[PDB]
């Protein structure tokens, strides 16, 4: 599963936030429970101490919207070669127009008022289904049981 395996071998990493959003780095612990870490402001980049085999995930600190790291969903630092730091490039994905619209509506209207918008109930349900690290982790497991 999404194990984040104990290594004891340090892996220097550079978290580079090239999204327009505030980024929440999320480290999966050894039990595989998401752990929130300090947020990266848009257009910032810092050297962070992680360990080899440790599994990370990144998200919009506010909306919990899904981001990408090196054009994929999970980042696992390789063992450093000759001390060279690994690079985690965090970016927006190309959201579907729908999901993107939901994002904007959700950002403008209080959740208790979703009910007041003159839209179809199905859209209201889609608004109510806020993005979520755990839901997405469950999906990523079934995508690994499907590669089996």
């Amino acid at each position: 599963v999404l194990r984040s395996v104990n290594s004891r071998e340090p892996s220097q990493v550079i978290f580079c936030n090239r999204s327009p959003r505030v980024v929440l780095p999320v480290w999966l612990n050894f039990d595989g429970e998401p752990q929130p870490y300090p947020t990266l402001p848009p257009g910032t980049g810092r050297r962070i101490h992680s360990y080899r085999g440790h599994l990370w995930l990144f998200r919009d600190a506010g909306t919990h919207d899904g981001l990408l790291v090196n054009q994929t969903e999970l980042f696992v630092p390789s063992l450093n070669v000759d001390g060279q730091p690994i690079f985690a490039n965090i970016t927006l994905p190309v959201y579907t127009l729908k999901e993107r619209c939901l994002q904007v509506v959700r950002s403008l209207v209080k959740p208790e008022n979703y009910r007041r918008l003159d839209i179809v109930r199905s859209l209201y349900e889609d608004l109510e289904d806020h993005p979520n690290v755990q839901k997405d982790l469950e999906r990523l497991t079934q995508e690994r049981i499907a590669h089996q």
Binding site: R18, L92, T96, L97, K98, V104, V105, D118, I119, L123
Partner: protein
């Protein structure tokens, strides 16, 4: 080739075929049996919306498979709801 999307108010939008196909609904309407005809009419989508729907096609086509940073696809509050409606109908 290019394709013509026509809004309720009757604006014509000429966009590349591949750009339009980003929409499953449009893909269906064009690939459905001259065959694969140029025009499609949206009686319930106004121009200020269908204009922006195209702008998304432009965006999606361009920035899918772009390796470094992608920029936010902006949506103004005033248009957000009608776009969400249009977006869902189109499947884009």
């Amino acid at each position: 080739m290019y394709v013509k999307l026509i809004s309720s108010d009757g604006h014509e939008f000429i966009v590349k075929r591949e750009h339009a196909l980003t929409s499953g609904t449009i893909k269906a309407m064009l690939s459905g049996p001259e065959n694969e005809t140029n025009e499609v009419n949206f009686r319930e989508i106004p121009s200020h919306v269908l204009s922006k729907v195209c702008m998304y096609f432009t965006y999606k086509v361009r920035y899918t498979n772009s390796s470094t940073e992608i920029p936010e696809f902006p949506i103004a509050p005033e248009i957000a709801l009608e776009l969400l409606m249009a977006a869902n109908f189109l499947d884009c």
